[PDB]
Amino acid sequence: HVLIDLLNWFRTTNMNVNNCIWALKSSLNSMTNAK
Amino acid sequence: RSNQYQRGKMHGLKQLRDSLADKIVDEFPELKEPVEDIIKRTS
Amino acid sequence: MTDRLTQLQICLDQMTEQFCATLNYIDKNHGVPPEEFSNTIDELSTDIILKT
Amino acid sequence: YQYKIQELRKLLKSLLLNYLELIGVLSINPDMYERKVENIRTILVNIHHLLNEYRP
């Protein structure tokens, strides 16, 4: 379960970072109108 | 690879905000006190 | 001649665009060699200060 | 009008300070970064409200 727990935690961190990047891109795309 | 990317981006961001804090202190001494608190708010 | 107001609006639009470009570079570049990244960010921060 | 000038200077300084603090948030704990983002926008919005009363 040890390798599987580390594996899942690192995957969660990875797509959390990816989702944060995508959210940043979406926020800039939305807020460019208000610029 | 994802972990190495995370560590490298953490180091990059750390140097980014360190340099930005240093220069904001340099050209704007009057805002020096909150900036350190900002570090205390982040670190 | 160009009006002081129109120049001020061009300046604040350029400032917003510069912040957007700087943060986009940060988001898409964090991880490029650290020295080149640091030099480019120092240039961007000097640009921020000058625009200010 | 000097009061409005000094208010806009202190608001710009606070906006730069909040931008620095927000990018630090992105650096260390970006998960709650939006918690400050809109806040900064409000200041920008308040600068835009001053710049709207400034039209007539």
PDB file of N, CA and C in Angstrom, chain B residues 4-5 7-9 11-13 15-17 19-20 23 27-28, chain C residues 26-31 34 37-38 41-42 45-46 48-49 52:
ATOM      1  N   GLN B   4      10.477  16.584  -9.617  1.00  0.00           N
ATOM      2  CA  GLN B   4      11.591  17.460  -9.961  1.00  0.00           C
ATOM      3  C   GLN B   4      11.091  18.795 -10.495  1.00  0.00           C
ATOM      4  N   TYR B   5      10.032  18.765 -11.309  1.00  0.00           N
ATOM      5  CA  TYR B   5       9.423  20.006 -11.782  1.00  0.00           C
ATOM      6  C   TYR B   5       8.893  20.829 -10.614  1.00  0.00           C
ATOM      7  N   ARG B   7       9.943  20.775  -7.448  1.00  0.00           N
ATOM      8  CA  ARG B   7      11.061  21.325  -6.687  1.00  0.00           C
ATOM      9  C   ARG B   7      11.726  22.478  -7.427  1.00  0.00           C
ATOM     10  N   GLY B   8      11.930  22.331  -8.738  1.00  0.00           N
ATOM     11  CA  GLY B   8      12.542  23.399  -9.507  1.00  0.00           C
ATOM     12  C   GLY B   8      11.689  24.650  -9.544  1.00  0.00           C
ATOM     13  N   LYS B   9      10.373  24.486  -9.707  1.00  0.00           N
ATOM     14  CA  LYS B   9       9.491  25.644  -9.709  1.00  0.00           C
ATOM     15  C   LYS B   9       9.393  26.274  -8.328  1.00  0.00           C
ATOM     16  N   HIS B  11      11.921  26.362  -6.137  1.00  0.00           N
ATOM     17  CA  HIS B  11      13.156  27.135  -6.030  1.00  0.00           C
ATOM     18  C   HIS B  11      13.085  28.408  -6.862  1.00  0.00           C
ATOM     19  N   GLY B  12      12.555  28.304  -8.081  1.00  0.00           N
ATOM     20  CA  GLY B  12      12.411  29.480  -8.920  1.00  0.00           C
ATOM     21  C   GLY B  12      11.516  30.531  -8.297  1.00  0.00           C
ATOM     22  N   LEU B  13      10.355  30.115  -7.782  1.00  0.00           N
ATOM     23  CA  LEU B  13       9.447  31.054  -7.134  1.00  0.00           C
ATOM     24  C   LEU B  13      10.086  31.673  -5.896  1.00  0.00           C
ATOM     25  N   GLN B  15      13.301  32.254  -5.355  1.00  0.00           N
ATOM     26  CA  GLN B  15      14.243  33.288  -5.778  1.00  0.00           C
ATOM     27  C   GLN B  15      13.511  34.491  -6.363  1.00  0.00           C
ATOM     28  N   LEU B  16      12.388  34.255  -7.052  1.00  0.00           N
ATOM     29  CA  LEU B  16      11.594  35.350  -7.597  1.00  0.00           C
ATOM     30  C   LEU B  16      11.160  36.300  -6.495  1.00  0.00           C
ATOM     31  N   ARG B  17      10.526  35.752  -5.462  1.00  0.00           N
ATOM     32  CA  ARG B  17       9.975  36.608  -4.420  1.00  0.00           C
ATOM     33  C   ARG B  17      11.065  37.179  -3.530  1.00  0.00           C
ATOM     34  N   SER B  19      14.087  38.159  -4.673  1.00  0.00           N
ATOM     35  CA  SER B  19      14.590  39.294  -5.437  1.00  0.00           C
ATOM     36  C   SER B  19      13.585  40.439  -5.460  1.00  0.00           C
ATOM     37  N   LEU B  20      12.298  40.117  -5.615  1.00  0.00           N
ATOM     38  CA  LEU B  20      11.277  41.156  -5.642  1.00  0.00           C
ATOM     39  C   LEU B  20      11.183  41.879  -4.303  1.00  0.00           C
ATOM     40  N   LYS B  23      14.306  44.209  -4.016  1.00  0.00           N
ATOM     41  CA  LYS B  23      14.223  45.436  -4.803  1.00  0.00           C
ATOM     42  C   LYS B  23      13.118  46.360  -4.305  1.00  0.00           C
ATOM     43  N   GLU B  27      14.212  50.295  -3.666  1.00  0.00           N
ATOM     44  CA  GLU B  27      13.640  51.519  -4.216  1.00  0.00           C
ATOM     45  C   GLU B  27      12.467  52.068  -3.414  1.00  0.00           C
ATOM     46  N   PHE B  28      11.843  51.271  -2.550  1.00  0.00           N
ATOM     47  CA  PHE B  28      10.730  51.728  -1.718  1.00  0.00           C
ATOM     48  C   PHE B  28      10.994  51.344  -0.268  1.00  0.00           C
TER      49      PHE B  28
ATOM     50  N   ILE C  26       6.172  33.583 -15.866  1.00  0.00           N
ATOM     51  CA  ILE C  26       6.417  32.863 -14.617  1.00  0.00           C
ATOM     52  C   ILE C  26       5.700  31.516 -14.628  1.00  0.00           C
ATOM     53  N   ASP C  27       4.440  31.503 -15.066  1.00  0.00           N
ATOM     54  CA  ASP C  27       3.645  30.278 -15.036  1.00  0.00           C
ATOM     55  C   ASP C  27       4.161  29.246 -16.032  1.00  0.00           C
ATOM     56  N   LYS C  28       4.586  29.685 -17.214  1.00  0.00           N
ATOM     57  CA  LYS C  28       5.038  28.770 -18.252  1.00  0.00           C
ATOM     58  C   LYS C  28       6.531  28.484 -18.198  1.00  0.00           C
ATOM     59  N   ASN C  29       7.268  29.110 -17.279  1.00  0.00           N
ATOM     60  CA  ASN C  29       8.708  28.921 -17.201  1.00  0.00           C
ATOM     61  C   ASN C  29       9.194  28.361 -15.869  1.00  0.00           C
ATOM     62  N   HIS C  30       8.357  28.331 -14.834  1.00  0.00           N
ATOM     63  CA  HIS C  30       8.791  27.804 -13.548  1.00  0.00           C
ATOM     64  C   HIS C  30       9.096  26.318 -13.655  1.00  0.00           C
ATOM     65  N   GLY C  31      10.194  25.903 -13.035  1.00  0.00           N
ATOM     66  CA  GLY C  31      10.609  24.509 -13.065  1.00  0.00           C
ATOM     67  C   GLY C  31      12.112  24.328 -13.006  1.00  0.00           C
ATOM     68  N   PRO C  34      18.086  28.184 -14.222  1.00  0.00           N
ATOM     69  CA  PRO C  34      17.821  29.184 -13.172  1.00  0.00           C
ATOM     70  C   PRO C  34      18.475  30.529 -13.426  1.00  0.00           C
ATOM     71  N   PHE C  37      16.564  32.383 -16.275  1.00  0.00           N
ATOM     72  CA  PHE C  37      15.260  32.738 -15.728  1.00  0.00           C
ATOM     73  C   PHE C  37      15.371  33.912 -14.762  1.00  0.00           C
ATOM     74  N   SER C  38      16.374  33.883 -13.882  1.00  0.00           N
ATOM     75  CA  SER C  38      16.564  34.976 -12.932  1.00  0.00           C
ATOM     76  C   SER C  38      16.907  36.277 -13.644  1.00  0.00           C
ATOM     77  N   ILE C  41      13.772  37.628 -15.284  1.00  0.00           N
ATOM     78  CA  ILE C  41      12.858  38.171 -14.286  1.00  0.00           C
ATOM     79  C   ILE C  41      13.382  39.488 -13.726  1.00  0.00           C
ATOM     80  N   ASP C  42      14.700  39.615 -13.568  1.00  0.00           N
ATOM     81  CA  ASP C  42      15.261  40.900 -13.154  1.00  0.00           C
ATOM     82  C   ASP C  42      14.963  41.976 -14.186  1.00  0.00           C
ATOM     83  N   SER C  45      11.297  42.866 -13.775  1.00  0.00           N
ATOM     84  CA  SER C  45      11.065  43.675 -12.583  1.00  0.00           C
ATOM     85  C   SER C  45      11.564  45.100 -12.782  1.00  0.00           C
ATOM     86  N   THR C  46      12.683  45.269 -13.487  1.00  0.00           N
ATOM     87  CA  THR C  46      13.124  46.610 -13.853  1.00  0.00           C
ATOM     88  C   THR C  46      12.098  47.289 -14.749  1.00  0.00           C
ATOM     89  N   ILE C  48       8.887  46.673 -14.624  1.00  0.00           N
ATOM     90  CA  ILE C  48       7.784  47.004 -13.722  1.00  0.00           C
ATOM     91  C   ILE C  48       8.069  48.314 -12.998  1.00  0.00           C
ATOM     92  N   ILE C  49       9.290  48.449 -12.473  1.00  0.00           N
ATOM     93  CA  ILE C  49       9.661  49.655 -11.735  1.00  0.00           C
ATOM     94  C   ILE C  49       9.620  50.875 -12.650  1.00  0.00           C
ATOM     95  N   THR C  52       6.088  51.848 -13.388  1.00  0.00           N
ATOM     96  CA  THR C  52       5.559  52.522 -12.211  1.00  0.00           C
ATOM     97  C   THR C  52       6.015  53.977 -12.163  1.00  0.00           C
TER      98      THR C  52
END
